[PDB]
Design a protein around this nucleic acid. Structure first.
Lengths: 102, 50, 37, 332, 113, 198
RNA sequence: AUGUGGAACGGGGUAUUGAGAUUCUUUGUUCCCAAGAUUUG
RNA sequence: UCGUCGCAAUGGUAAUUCAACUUAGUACGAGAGGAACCGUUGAUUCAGAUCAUUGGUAUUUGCGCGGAGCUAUCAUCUGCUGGAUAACGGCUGAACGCCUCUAAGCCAGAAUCCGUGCCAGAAAGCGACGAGG
RNA sequence: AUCAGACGAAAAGGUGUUAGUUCA
């Protein structure tokens, strides 16, 4: 199972929820919600929407296809690495928000 | 095979002969039972034939 | 036919037989673990 | 209305699902309970691979419209003796447990605040004062009975439900001898049993319940069939909504509690499909009358990932926890 | 033929993805009315009655799990009445049912999706 | 090996036979998969993996003997499972190209691949590098139309599988053994065997 | 029907909304309170 | 008198199913045809439904959206199964020393019937159970 | 008599019978 990213809302896409669209150029687009799908159908610019994460990132308000053999030790190490990375990212986001507020 | 293949196979179940003998002995009883149980136009046709 | 259970893990070239018979994480905390490992 | 099997259509009085037919039992069968009362927590769809020979999706992951049913462990607080009579099945004597909760005692009292709340109070007296009378009642049941059923009351207090009167259902102990059934219930008197003990979740459970009142539209008891359980998650288990694939811990309760029910705190049973009756309704999960051997029952459940998107309201994430770092730091 | 019909988006005007000289093949009738994504159905050439497996379907097709995917348009790849793809090569995504309905149609397809 | 999966003679469409491993697809007959296992399965693993849940994934499988450079449309979980299922010597890769039916598009003979005329050069080169077979961009579905193998599967009439124009779909040509469907003509099968030095 | 009481508010959460507001829940406040008549037994 | 938890006199009944790919180009069949066979995928029509999630929602009169929930397979469930038999086929076996499905009988066997399951229950059908002097 | 009896489909069929007559 892979959690796709929304094309408009730039958010995670879970099975059963959201809408998947395929273009003529073999392009796959995911909408996090009905409003995001409606905005995509209305040709709304992702960077021109306040609630969209794309605009938040590019406005100063925010900061593997190669097969690999399975390894239990690597997976166990990656389990703690993901938590450490998330904690570091949360701390960095909090620092960025504090700097932006000031 | 070809042509009368079924006839050729016959030329080339044995219990049917025993079954036929049993049916032949029961034929006398079967004819009486069928005639007595027949109803409608079929009963009249069977009686006329007999 | 139609009731026989066929397991794809048996036809594996994994070094560890236990690892081949054991599933791996796919998605965790909203992130695709299988696609990010 | 074409099917006269359900016509004429009249609303069923008892909200609790009634077991009009309990499963048949034999001495070879071990003594066990056949029914367990549950509450309609929710029925969101969760993904799960299908390991089924000949399946078009053999070994392929499938999102399934499953159903979570809140199942607080049932408490057996009495027994009934049923004598086989040429005019039917008669109740010989009923031997209750010595002590009863206020909730089950409340069931008898329409108001419960009336004057004295005397439910089985003298009965509790004569129970302790004369245990020999209960021994004779047990002896009479073992000597002059064929069908032994146990009085069971609902632990609504664990559930987030306003109703205080504990729903009492006469679950039938099945298997073994009549004395064995009486002995099991006697040793289990004033004791609770989880549904995980009653059902193994690989078993095919024909849950029955009363359809909701549409506003005679609806409100009729119905018996669902061919509903194999998928996960009897216990309430203490916070990994219940976290399968092996989605190992990250997540409670069965999704974000925003449950629709018109609130969060789940006690044991639950996961089962595909839908059942009659609204949310948080007393649902009779019971043993299947027929030991159906369909490949769906034969195949085990290997749940891929539990959906925990928002209940009442709308949620685009499995849990807020992952969404906390997923979105940027909030204004707060 | 091959495969079992499944409940999916009955998208397939059925654009003739197969290179039969027709860009679009309006579905005249459903063989065996609408055809799911990858189901061959009689189609009279709209632009540019023959079977037309819907390689691409505009309507969202619920996947195996239930993942609904909507293609750009309801494109029904042209298939001969025998079952093989009438066109030399199908274009765009090719539905899995189209592969089941006609392996040649999937074979002719440049893209299989 | 002129054998048809169940009643379907599209052996190449069902299985992308290659010298190292036959990229078969799930959903085929178990006996046919065993028949493919008996014919060339020992030399060429015939594990039936439905790339992207497709029973005709063998048509679209762009993975040759040296490299399993199948298109990225193949399921990642299946590809990861196939990576553990198959030996690491096969350069398994996900060809993220618009033409998801790259295997049908590319006549990936083990000696030299033949990509579609409109196939991306970078995608063809990436498939060529893994397959260790020089790609040749040249119906567009070169792999589907004509069966390709190092041993040699001749060429389509424009024909294997009872004169079917899609020889590659009908015949699963591999360097170890140029398999085909049961409907393949005796003259066509003999010609393919003669082309394959067999 | 003298209480972990029930209920209404002060609210808050949930979501809605797309910086703002709203509405199941609340160790907060108060109302309510051994809450009266009728009916039989 | 008020409740608890049950038995069931009596009715009604439902799922009809096929359809298409394997199971099959399967045994058998010179071969064609095609069994047995096995699951899966769905679907014709009709019945009880949940209303989770989603679409609609629609005085939240909150902010076109639209909460809380309702309706909608438009989100989803979803429709049982063991005997006795009809025709017919047999075993036993007289009548009619044998023979003879039949006459005493029995078995197999229909989409048939009966029960099972389901829906109710007999406002005056009952049992156990707690609480008028 | 599984369409008893008590109150034309009727011609016949009865390996359905009860009694008797004739030839034997």
């Amino acid at each position: 199972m892979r959690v796709h990213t929304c094309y408009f809302c730039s958010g995670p896409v879970y099975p059963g929820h959201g809408i998947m669209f395929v273009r003529n150029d073999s392009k796959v687009f995911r909408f996090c919600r009905s409003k995001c799908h409606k905005n995509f159908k209305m040709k709304r610019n992702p960077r021109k929407v306040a609630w969209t994460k794309a605009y938040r990132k590019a406005h100063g308000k925010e900061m593997r296809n190669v097969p690999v053999r399975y390894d239990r030790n690597v997976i166990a190490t990656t389990l703690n690495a993901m938590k450490r990375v998330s904690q570091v990212h949360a701390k960095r986001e909090r620092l960025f928000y504090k700097k932006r507020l000031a | 095979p070809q042509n009368e293949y079924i006839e050729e196979s016959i030329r080339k179940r044995f219990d049917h002969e025993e079954r036929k003998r049993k049916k032949a002995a029961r034929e006398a009883h079967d004819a009486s039972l069928y005639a007595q149980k027949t109803r409608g136009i079929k009963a009249k046709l069977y009686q006329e034939k007999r | 036919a139609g009731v026989y259970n066929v397991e794809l893990r048996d036809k594996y070239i994994l070094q560890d037989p236990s690892w081949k018979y054991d599933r791996m994480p796919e998605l965790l905390d909203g992130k695709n673990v299988a696609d990010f490992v | 209305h074409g099917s006269l099997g359900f016509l004429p259509r009249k609303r069923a009085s008892r909200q609790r699902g009634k077991v009009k037919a309990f499963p048949k039992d034999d001495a070879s069968k071990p003594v066990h309970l056949t029914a367990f009362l549950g509450y309609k927590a929710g029925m969101t769809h969760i993904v799960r691979d299908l390991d089924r020979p000949g399946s078009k999706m053999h070994k392929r992951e499938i999102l399934e419209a499953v159903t979570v049913i809140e199942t607080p462990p049932m408490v057996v607080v009495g027994v009934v003796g049923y004598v086989e009579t040429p005019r039917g099945l008669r109740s010989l004597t009923t031997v209750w447990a010595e002590h009863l909760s206020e909730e089950v005692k409340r069931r008898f009292y329409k108001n419960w605040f009336k004057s004295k709340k005397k439910a089985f109070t003298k009965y509790a007296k004569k129970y302790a004062e004369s245990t020999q009378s209960i021994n004779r009642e047990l002896e009479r049941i073992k000597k002059y009975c064929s069908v032994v059923r146990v009085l069971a009351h609902t632990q609504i207090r664990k559930t987030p439900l306003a109703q205080k009167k504990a729903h009492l259902m006469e679950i039938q102990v099945n298997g073994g001898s009549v004395a064995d059934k009486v002995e099991w219930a006697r040793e289990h008197f004033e004791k609770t049993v989880d549904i995980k003990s009653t059902f193994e979740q690989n078993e095919m459970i024909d849950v029955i319940g009363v359809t909701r009142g549409k506003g005679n539209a609806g409100y009729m008891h119905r018996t669902q069939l061919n509903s194999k359980i998928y996960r009897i998650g216990a309430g203490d288990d916070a990994k219940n909504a976290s399968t092996d694939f989605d190992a990250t811990e997540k409670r069965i309760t999704p974000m925003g509690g449950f629709v018109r029910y609130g969060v789940v705190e006690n044991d639950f049973v996961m089962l595909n499909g839908a059942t009659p009756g609204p949310v948080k309704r007393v649902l009779t999960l019971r043993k299947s009358l027929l030991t159906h051997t369909s490949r769906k029952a034969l195949e085990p459940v290997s749940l891929k990932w539990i959906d925990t998107a928002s209940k009442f309201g709308h949620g685009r994430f499995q849990t807020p926890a992952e969404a906390k770092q997923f979105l940027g730091t909030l204004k707060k | 033929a091959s495969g079992t019909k499944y409940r999916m988006t009955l998208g397939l005007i059925m654009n003739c993805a197969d290179n039969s000289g027709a860009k679009n093949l309006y579905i005249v009738s459903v063989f065996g009315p609408a055809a799911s994504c990858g189901d061959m159905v009689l189609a009279t050439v709209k632009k540019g009655i023959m079977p037309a497996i819907v390689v691409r379907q505009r309507k969202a097709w619920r996947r195996k799990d239930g993942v609904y995917l909507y293609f750009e348009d309801n494109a029904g790849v042209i298939v001969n009445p025998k079952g093989e793809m009438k066109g030399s090569a199908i274009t765009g995504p090719v539905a899995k049912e189209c592969a089941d309905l006609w392996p040649r149609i999937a074979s002719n397809a440049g893209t299989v999706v | 090996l002129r054998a048809q999966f169940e009643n379907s003679n599209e052996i190449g469409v069902f299985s992308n036979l290659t010298n190292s491993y036959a990229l078969v697809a799930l959903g085929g007959s178990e006996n046919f998969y065993s028949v493919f296992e008996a014919e060339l399965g020992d030399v060429v693993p015939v594990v039936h993996t439905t790339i992207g849940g497709t029973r005709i994934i063998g048509r679209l499988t762009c993975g040759n003997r040296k490299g399993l450079l199948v298109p990225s449309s193949t399921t990642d979980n299946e590809l990861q499972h196939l990576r553990n299922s198959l030996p690491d010597p096969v350069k398994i890769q996900r060809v993220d190209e618009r033409l998801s039916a790259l295997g049908n598009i590319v006549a990936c003979n083990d000696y030299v691949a033949l990509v579609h005329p409109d196939i991306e050069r970078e995608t063809e080169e990436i498939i060529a590098d893994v397959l260790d077979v020089e790609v040749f961009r040249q119906n567009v579905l070169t792999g589907s139309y004509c069966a390709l193998s190092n041993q040699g599967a001749l060429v389509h009439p424009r024909t294997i599988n009872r004169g079917s124009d899609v020889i590659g779909a009908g015949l699963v040509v591999n360097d170890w053994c140029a398999f085909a469907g049961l409907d393949t003509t005796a003259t066509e099968l003999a010609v393919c065997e003669s082309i394959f030095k067999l």
